[PDB]
Specification:
The structure is cut from a larger assembly and holds chains A (about 150 residues), B (about 50 residues), C (about 40 residues), D (about 160 residues), E (about 90 residues) and F (about 30 residues). By secondary structure, chain A is mainly α. Chain A is about 50% helix and about 10% strand. By secondary structure, chain D is α+β, with helices and mostly antiparallel strands. The chains are: A mainly alpha (about 150), B mainly alpha (about 50), C mainly alpha (about 40), D alpha+beta (about 160), E mainly alpha (about 90), F mainly alpha (about 30). The interface between A and F is medium-sized, with 31 and 22 residues. The complex binds magnesium ion (8 copies). The structure holds one RNA strand of 290 nucleotides. It is classed as ribosome.
RNA sequence: AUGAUUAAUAGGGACGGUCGGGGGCAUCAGUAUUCAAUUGUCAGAGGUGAAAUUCUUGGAUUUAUUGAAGACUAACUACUGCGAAAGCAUUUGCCAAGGACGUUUUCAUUAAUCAAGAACGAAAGUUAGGGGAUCGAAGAUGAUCAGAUACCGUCGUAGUCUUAACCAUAAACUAUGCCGACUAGGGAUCGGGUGGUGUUUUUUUAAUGACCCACUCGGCACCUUACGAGAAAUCAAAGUCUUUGGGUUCUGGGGGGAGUAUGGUCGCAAGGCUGAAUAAAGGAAUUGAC
């Protein structure tokens, strides 16, 4: 539950928080102690209220996950580093080949411009807000890179 | 039927002297000179109030 | 059922030797009860 | 001090020609062409004396002469887990248990014999017997308390009796 | 000597109250089975003057005053102390 | 929020299917 | 050219032979893992409790002669050693450093403790390069049958290594401040020293070296102890004749498991366009009904 309620910049801020928070708002109601059940569980319990947004924010379910995942592999590490992994370039490079169908150095350069122009390449996913990812999500779409 | 002995954790709760400063200011500085007259005069004032 | 926790007197040759050769021990207690009863009655 | 009970079975039943060499501190077994008859007796005698050499009671070692499907399994604690210092020393105590009770618990249930030569463990039995024993001893190494292992030892014991 | 030595520091390093309590328990049982009033009177004589085995001692008073002996295990130790003191006072 | 509204509104201009796009789930394959 | 006394079983320095898995820089060896070459053979190989992804007739696995990459020093390894601690196990060389021992050598109180302040600091982690053999968080995927073998396999990013910089937390334990004195017996071990008309060796003697015995310093420790302390476990220190003074630094004013409220302090969201749709024999039936 604390991951769901986690706010940007907090220790428990994670991919689950980022994904759920943009499709709904979660709020704490009460705390339930382990004594309140028998046989007593080894973990504490809680009650939360989930309010799903109507209308659903019009962003692709896959694209939002795709960007969130690659940057949350190391949340406390810089976003630029998260894209330095070799497989991140390979999975992303083919995704660009898909865009052209309907170049490793180029996708390297394109990523460099996006992180530099958005001024997001030097911050950490654990300290980022919905808007920051959305701006990151755009800047890749403009340069033709789609995550998922 | 084996029960290991508890590991008495190092105190993470604030120590008593620290608790004084856990507010916006230093609680030790805003005191009075005569705590004896502090209690007596207030008790009279409270009932007069 | 109970599993012994002390060293077996029988050696591995002996335990297998037992297998080489419902229970006679049960059938001895079978009779020993009878004579106690036969004497008691 | 046990040699008086070692050479008789080999020389008589196996018809082997036995000797122990003080100078090299080794045992010597030779097949007698005019007397020996079983081709597998020589290796069987070698198999038997090795078992004693690993730390085994003689009478248990005799089982290898009597039968043919008894084998030696061997491994070290470090193969299971890299335990050091007290962690290693305690882990040995877990396998033996108090008064060696735990080692006797496994042995009776599985129909094998165990020698805890410091970090070195050797197991004698049928292939089915030793393998399950390997599981029980290893489970102790990983940190399982013996009492839980004792329950599992009882479980496998019943399966052994039914079949 | 080296073997008898070797068994000691390993045993000396194991200080666990459950283990040591078990060892002490069986030691007394062996002591009693295997192995006069003047000594007893002297033993009571020391006990009756010093007053060492009641709850005025530093340890016992510390446990009692702080809602700390209500846990059973420490109560057993406190009670064991009183009986042993009670045994000395016996006549 | 109003900044968010522009971005999400602008996102409509750049939207594409995901069918052939390989997800980032493949990231660990290496 | 010219005023005072010791040289503390206090301290600093010097000198002599040693001692050490102490540190840094080079250098050597070592199997093993992976990969590659050549080489003989032909079906599987692998892995689990049981299997499949997986590699394999372009030859797997296995055999043998080599080579290359990067770690790392097994067995010796011990109730042993060195370092302030964290830590430290191949060969040889260089660099400086160090404890103890011996000294009829030297300075003469130079010392103990330590807020402030400074150096180092397990593993993990951050920045920028190199390297990347093995392992391997994350991740995908084979299999999802069976409870002792119930979390297994294949691939594997960051990381594991190194260079130059950041963080400063552990059951960083002896759950046990530092310095000094005193208070029982015994023999094991390490380093040094002393002594013997002791053994072995030097296989010419010898002298050394290795052992034996006795003593003496310093160290890790260990047995017995109605010596004292403790409730006890236990402790030669957690001891110093009933109640308390050798010197000094730091910490605490009450434990453990649950809850309640808050005139207190400091923090903590989203949302404004979008909307579904016969109760019942009107039955079951290889089992029924008349
Ligand atoms: Mg006044
Ligand atoms: Mg002097
Ligand atoms: Mg010197
Ligand atoms: Mg050494
Ligand atoms: Mg030291
Ligand atoms: Mg790097
Ligand atoms: Mg330690
Ligand atoms: Mg002292």
């Amino acid at each position: 539950a604390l991951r769901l309620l986690a706010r940007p910049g907090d220790s428990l801020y994670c991919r689950l928080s980022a994904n759920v928070q943009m499709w709904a708002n979660v709020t704490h109601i009460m705390k339930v102690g382990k004594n309140n059940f028998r046989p007593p569980p080894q973990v504490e319990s809680s009650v939360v209220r989930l309010e799903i947004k109507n209308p659903r924010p019009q962003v692709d379910y896959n694209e939002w996950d795709g960007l969130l995942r690659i940057v949350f592999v190391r949340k406390n590490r810089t976003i630029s580093a998260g894209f330095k992994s070799t497989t991140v370039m390979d999975i992303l490079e083919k995704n660009y080949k898909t865009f052209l169908a309907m170049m490793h150095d180029v996708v390297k350069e394109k990523i460099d411009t996006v992180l530099k122009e958005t001024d997001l390449g030097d911050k950490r996913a654990g300290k980022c807000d919905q808007n920051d990812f959305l701006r990151l999500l755009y800047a890749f779409h403009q340069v033709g890179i789609h995550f998922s | 039927e084996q029960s290991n002995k508890q590991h008495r954790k190092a105190k993470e709760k604030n120590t008593a002297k620290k608790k004084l400063h856990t507010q916006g200011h230093n609680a030790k500085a805003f005191a009075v000179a005569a705590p004896g007259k502090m209690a007596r005069t207030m008790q009279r004032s409270s009932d007069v109030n | 059922f109970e599993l012994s926790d002390v060293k077996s007197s029988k050696s591995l040759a002996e335990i297998y030797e037992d297998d080489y050769t419902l229970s006679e021990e049960l059938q001895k207690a079978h009779s020993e009860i009878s004579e106690l009863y036969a004497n008691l009655v | 001090n046990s040699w008086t009970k070692i050479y008789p079975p080999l020389v008589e039943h196996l018809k082997l020609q036995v000797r122990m060499n003080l100078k090299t501190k080794s045992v010597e077994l030779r097949t007698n062409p005019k007397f020996t008859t079983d081709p597998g007796a020589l290796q069987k005698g070698a198999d038997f004396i090795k078992a004693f050499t690993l730390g085994f009671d003689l009478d248990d070692s005799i089982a290898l002469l009597r039968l043919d499907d008894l084998y030696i399994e061997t491994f070290e604690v470090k193969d299971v887990k890299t335990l050091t210092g007290d962690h290693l020393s305690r882990a040995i105590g877990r396998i033996a248990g108090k008064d060696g009770k735990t080692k006797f618990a496994i042995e009776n249930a599985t129909r094998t014999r165990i020698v805890l030569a410091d970090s070195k463990i050797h197991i004698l039995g049928g292939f089915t017997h030793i393998r399950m024993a390997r599981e029980s001893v290893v489970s102790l190494i990983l940190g399982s308390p013996p009492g839980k292992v004792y329950g599992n030892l009882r479980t496998v014991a019943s399966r052994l009796k039914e079949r | 000597m080296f073997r008898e030595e070797r068994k000691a520091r390993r045993l000396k390093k194991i200080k666990s109250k459950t283990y040591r309590k078990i060892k002490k328990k069986e030691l007394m049982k062996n002591r009693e089975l295997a192995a006069d009033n003047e000594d007893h009177d002297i033993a009571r004589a020391k006990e009756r003057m010093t007053l060492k085995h009641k709850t005025n001692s530093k340890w016992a008073k510390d446990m009692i005053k702080h809602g700390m002996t209500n846990d059973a295990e420490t109560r057993e130790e406190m009670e064991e102390m009183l009986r042993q003191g009670e045994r000395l006072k016996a006549k | 929020r109003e900044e968010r509204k522009t971005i999400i509104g602008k996102l409509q201009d750049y939207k594409i299917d995901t069918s052939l796009l390989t997800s980032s789930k493949r990231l660990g394959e290496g």
